[PDB]
Amino acid sequence: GPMSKGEELFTGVVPILVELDGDVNGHKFSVSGEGEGDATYGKLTLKFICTTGKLPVPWPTLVTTFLQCFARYPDHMKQHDFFKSAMPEGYVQERTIFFKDDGNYKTRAEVKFEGDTLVNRIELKGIDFKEDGNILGHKLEYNYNSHNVYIMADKQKNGIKVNFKIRHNIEDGSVQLADHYQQNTPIGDGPVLLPDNHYLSTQSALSKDPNEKRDHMVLLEFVTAAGITHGM
């Protein structure tokens, strides 16, 4: 049987909407995204458009901000899926992202069902970026590395927490570190699943739509949970 009501909402393909309101160093920008997710396979397919013009930061720096409820949790781990258990009312996802030797992003997002669509709505505030640094200078390669992140329960606040480092490839062969600190809290009062410590493993591919003239990103992602019971 299902371990939560929300688990049942993800057994097939679900449409996705993403809306981001951004302000980096006083530059305001907006991004809209559309696509589909299939948590049976842990797969996301998304297209984002900057509706205000050229995106003032590199697209790869926003990948983590733009849906962990679509992670594939194997049968033996479904009791640890906090993200689906918060649905349909959803969760708040908050992060500070510290870019080494550069500025920070602060983000607040709500992830929930609106009608039949899973919607991620984000406010982003970026401050203290260098005008000619890797971010505002668009020195990041248009690609993305794979990452394994360590999910832990926050029992006192009835949610989950995670810290992880994202590595962004730079055009000179160096790496720009983006240090993530993340807190997720349920929006509703209902019971949720608080997990044992485990990993989410993510693989992402970035591409372009050949028929899209606007500044945009196509994102394909695969996310799966992996446990550390080590029963052996």
Side-chain angles (χ1 to χ4, degrees), residues 14-20 31-37 45-48 66-67 70 110-112 114 116-122:
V14 174
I16 298 167
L17 177 65
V18 180
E19 300 288 0
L20 179 146
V31 176
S32 294
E34 291 177 8
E36 300 79 45
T45 296
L46 298 155
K47 180 184 182 191
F48 305 89
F66 293 145
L67 293 154
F70 286 99
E110 294 189 6
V111 186
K112 67 166 82 188
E114 302 181 354
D116 73 351
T117 298
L118 191 289
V119 182
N120 180 22
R121 293 178 184 280
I122 307 131

Side-chain angles (χ1 to χ4, degrees), residues 113-133:
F113 278 95
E114 302 181 354
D116 73 351
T117 298
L118 191 289
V119 182
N120 180 22
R121 293 178 184 280
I122 307 131
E123 179 195 6
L124 182 149
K125 284 202 230 172
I127 62 170
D128 299 324
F129 285 91
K130 296 169 172 176
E131 302 276 11
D132 43 356

Side-chain angles (χ1 to χ4, degrees), residues 2-226:
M3 304 295 319
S4 72
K5 283 194 170 183
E7 179 191 320
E8 311 180 294
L9 306 180
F10 293 86
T11 51
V13 181
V14 174
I16 298 167
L17 177 65
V18 180
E19 300 288 0
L20 179 146
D21 180 77
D23 183 328
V24 172
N25 279 27
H27 299 288
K28 295 209 150 67
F29 60 98
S30 305
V31 176
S32 294
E34 291 177 8
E36 300 79 45
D38 194 354
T40 301
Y41 299 100
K43 285 196 179 325
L44 295 164
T45 296
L46 298 155
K47 180 184 182 191
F48 305 89
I49 300 91
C50 183
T51 58
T52 46
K54 184 182 169 56
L55 190 72
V57 298
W59 283 106
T61 69
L62 300 178
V63 166
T64 54
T65 298
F66 293 145
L67 293 154
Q68 293 165 315
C69 47
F70 286 99
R72 182 182 81 92
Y73 275 74
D75 285 343
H76 70 275
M77 284 180 71
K78 285 189 184 309
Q79 67 264 43
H80 305 296
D81 190 344
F82 162 85
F83 306 98
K84 296 186 189 53
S85 82
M87 297 299 162
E89 285 172 283
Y91 50 81
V92 179
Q93 176 161 309
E94 303 170 288
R95 292 206 183 98
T96 306
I97 303 175
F98 304 80
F99 292 90
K100 180 172 169 65
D101 301 318
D102 213 327
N104 304 329
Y105 294 165
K106 293 163 111 313
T107 67
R108 182 189 192 278
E110 294 189 6
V111 186
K112 67 166 82 188
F113 278 95
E114 302 181 354
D116 73 351
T117 298
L118 191 289
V119 182
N120 180 22
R121 293 178 184 280
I122 307 131
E123 179 195 6
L124 182 149
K125 284 202 230 172
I127 62 170
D128 299 324
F129 285 91
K130 296 169 172 176
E131 302 276 11
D132 43 356
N134 291 330
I135 285 78
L136 291 182
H138 294 274
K139 312 190 183 181
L140 262 66
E141 298 183 346
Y142 190 74
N143 54 41
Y144 214 83
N145 298 127
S146 306
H147 304 93
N148 301 310
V149 309
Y150 195 71
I151 308 291
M152 302 180 74
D154 181 342
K155 275 162 21 67
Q156 186 187 324
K157 299 199 216 61
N158 209 29
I160 59 91
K161 55 186 177 176
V162 48
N163 299 355
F164 55 100
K165 288 193 203 313
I166 293 296
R167 299 179 67 89
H168 296 295
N169 289 345
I170 308 308
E171 66 193 351
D172 64 358
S174 66
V175 164
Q176 169 71 59
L177 291 179
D179 202 14
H180 289 55
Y181 298 78
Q182 177 183 336
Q183 185 80 28
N184 287 49
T185 308
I187 288 171
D189 286 294
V192 293
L193 297 173
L194 299 180
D196 291 346
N197 302 350
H198 64 284
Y199 289 94
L200 290 182
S201 297
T202 310
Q203 307 227 179
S204 308
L206 317 187
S207 57
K208 298 291 186 179
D209 179 354
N211 300 135
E212 180 56 71
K213 285 167 167 298
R214 295 169 293 190
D215 202 3
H216 72 285
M217 168 171 73
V218 177
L219 171 68
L220 274 72
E221 279 218 330
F222 166 74
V223 186
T224 183

